[PDB]
Design an enzyme around this catalytic site. Structure first.
Site, PDB file in Angstrom:
ATOM      1  N   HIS A 260       0.868  -1.228   0.000  1.00  0.00           N
ATOM      2  CA  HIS A 260       0.000   0.000   0.000  1.00  0.00           C
ATOM      3  C   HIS A 260       0.865   1.224   0.000  1.00  0.00           C
ATOM      4  CE1 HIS A 260      -0.065   0.026   4.543  1.00  0.00           C
ATOM      5  NE2 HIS A 260      -0.332  -1.243   4.345  1.00  0.00           N
TER       6      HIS A 260
ATOM      7  N   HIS B 148       6.385   6.975   5.902  1.00  0.00           N
ATOM      8  CA  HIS B 148       5.880   6.512   4.582  1.00  0.00           C
ATOM      9  C   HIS B 148       5.215   7.754   3.936  1.00  0.00           C
ATOM     10  CE1 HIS B 148       2.553   6.000   7.373  1.00  0.00           C
ATOM     11  NE2 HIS B 148       1.929   6.523   6.325  1.00  0.00           N
TER      12      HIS B 148
ATOM     13  N   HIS C  61       2.076   9.174   0.961  1.00  0.00           N
ATOM     14  CA  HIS C  61       0.830   9.001   0.238  1.00  0.00           C
ATOM     15  C   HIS C  61       0.995   9.929  -0.986  1.00  0.00           C
ATOM     16  CE1 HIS C  61      -1.205   6.974   3.557  1.00  0.00           C
ATOM     17  NE2 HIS C  61      -0.374   7.761   4.143  1.00  0.00           N
TER      18      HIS C  61
ATOM     19  N   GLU D 263      -3.368  13.573   1.881  1.00  0.00           N
ATOM     20  CA  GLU D 263      -4.598  13.072   2.576  1.00  0.00           C
ATOM     21  C   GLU D 263      -5.267  14.273   3.250  1.00  0.00           C
ATOM     22  OE1 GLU D 263      -3.277   9.481   4.859  1.00  0.00           O
ATOM     23  OE2 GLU D 263      -4.330   8.620   3.195  1.00  0.00           O
TER      24      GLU D 263
ATOM     25  N   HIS E   7       4.297  10.944   6.237  1.00  0.00           N
ATOM     26  CA  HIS E   7       3.843  10.654   7.620  1.00  0.00           C
ATOM     27  C   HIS E   7       4.985  10.037   8.389  1.00  0.00           C
ATOM     28  CE1 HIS E   7      -0.683  10.474   6.265  1.00  0.00           C
ATOM     29  NE2 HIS E   7      -0.215  11.696   6.447  1.00  0.00           N
TER      30      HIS E   7
ATOM     31  N   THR F 133      -4.883   6.408   8.851  1.00  0.00           N
ATOM     32  CA  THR F 133      -5.632   6.667   7.630  1.00  0.00           C
ATOM     33  C   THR F 133      -5.756   5.388   6.763  1.00  0.00           C
ATOM     34  OG1 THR F 133      -3.752   7.498   6.367  1.00  0.00           O
ATOM     35  CG2 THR F 133      -5.068   9.208   7.674  1.00  0.00           C
ATOM     36  N   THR F 134      -5.188   4.314   7.272  1.00  0.00           N
ATOM     37  CA  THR F 134      -5.435   3.001   6.562  1.00  0.00           C
ATOM     38  C   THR F 134      -6.011   2.051   7.640  1.00  0.00           C
ATOM     39  OG1 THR F 134      -3.125   2.454   7.250  1.00  0.00           O
ATOM     40  CG2 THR F 134      -3.469   3.322   4.945  1.00  0.00           C
TER      41      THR F 134
END
Ligand SMILES: [Zn+2]
Length: 258
Positions: free
Chosen positions: A62, A92, A94, A104, A117, A196-197
């Site tokens: 992901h 990580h 996004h 996000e 993040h 957020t996941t």
């Protein structure tokens, strides 16, 4: 089937397996700059990353995570709205398929090309797994990326992506200093939210920096060459791995600045 960011298993489907997806303190949110409350009681953040020990970079299907040794207080975050010491465990990103989307959090509905993040857990809980079950278990620093000039400190990350192109791949990644990813200013917004996941646990104090960092078009291009799939599976580019903004509900965003 298993969650992801496609049409059939994307964010709008997550609630079926993770009912907390429709919870009262979900993230990300839109930061309305004119409704955020300046709070003079908030202290400046304290980022101590000089003893940081990176170990490995991994494609988990992901995103890609850079992981750190968190067996001791080597890279910690304290101050700001936090009580206690939070140790860095991994960072990580996004990102989007196009430069106009990818973050996000949004600022007055403005989307950035990507969002970094830095994940930290509250040492009072002993380990990460215990920390996520507590309302104050994690502190995440969110940094926006805009496309412009290259960021020198990100290049080492960019260069290893070819070696972890598909899910489950990992590579040794030592001696990486996360201080090369910070903006000049540590002014921030803060609110109580969630991962957020999935599992989307509501255990995060978010700390979103006001100042974005710049990355070049070429650097972000390299992110978009990763794959969601495992080796020998049909290729699915890892792009658009961001969850849209969620309702603020009964929450107030506080600002450390005016
Ligand atoms: Zn994230």
């Amino acid at each position: 089937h298993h969650w992801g960011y496609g049409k059939h298993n994307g964010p709008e489907h997550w609630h079926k397996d993770f009912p907390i997806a429709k919870g009262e303190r979900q993230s990300p949110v839109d930061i309305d700059t004119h409704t955020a409350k300046y709070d003079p009681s908030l202290k400046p953040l304290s980022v101590s990353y000089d003893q940081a020990t990176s170990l490995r970079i991994l494609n988990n299907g992901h995103a890609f995570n850079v992981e750190f040794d968190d067996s001791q207080d080597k890279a910690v975050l304290k101050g700001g709205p936090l009580d206690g010491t939070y140790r860095l465990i991994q960072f990580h990103f996004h990102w989007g398929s196009l430069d106009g989307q990818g973050s996000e959090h949004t600022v007055d509905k403005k989307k950035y090309a990507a969002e970094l993040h830095l994940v930290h857990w509250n040492t009072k809980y002993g380990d990460f797994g215990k920390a996520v079950q507590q309302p104050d278990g994690l502190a995440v620093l969110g940094i926006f990326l805009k496309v412009g000039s290259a960021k020198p400190g990100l290049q080492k990350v960019v260069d290893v992506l070819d070696s972890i192109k598909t899910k489950g791949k990992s590579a040794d990644f030592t001696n990486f200093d996360p201080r090369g990813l910070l903006p000049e200013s540590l002014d921030y917004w803060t609110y109580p939210g969630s991962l957020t996941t999935p599992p989307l646990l509501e255990c995060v104090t978010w700390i979103v920096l006001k100042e974005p960092i710049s990355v070049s078009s070429e650097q972000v291009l390299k992110f978009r060459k990763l794959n969601f799939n495992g080796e020998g599976e049909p290729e699915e580019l890892m792009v658009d791995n961001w969850r849209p903004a969620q309702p603020l509900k009964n929450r107030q965003i506080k600002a450390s600045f005016k």
